[PDB]
Amino acid sequence: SEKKPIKISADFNAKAKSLGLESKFSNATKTALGDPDTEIRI
């Protein structure tokens, strides 16, 4: 809060997340309709 609210490290997955770009390195997002269980239920 008082100090720097970012604190970048050498992980690049926490670094990317802390600056907003978190899902922007994955091909496609995660959804609910992709499992056969929900399909069978529907």
Binding site: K3, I6, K7, I8, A10, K15, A16, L19, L21, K24
Partner: protein, 60 residues
């Protein structure tokens, strides 16, 4: 290991945002800056340089 338009734009935007957030002093990068400098590695390399220099000095 693969490069697509999304990856490229995300990488460039991340670099830009990091630089700007550093301009406003909104980021603390002591861990990265001391893992890159690595003062322990600095001392090790300095002692290695000294030993190599002594070796070259004494062979004459």
């Amino acid at each position: 290991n693969n490069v697509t338009l999304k990856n490229l734009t995300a990488f460039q935007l991340l670099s830009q945002r990091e630089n700007i957030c550093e301009l406003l002093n909104l980021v603390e990068s002591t861990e990265r800056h001391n893992s890159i400098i690595n003062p322990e590695r600095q001392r090790m390399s300095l002692e290695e340089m000294k030993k190599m220099l002594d070796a070259l000095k004494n062979e004459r």
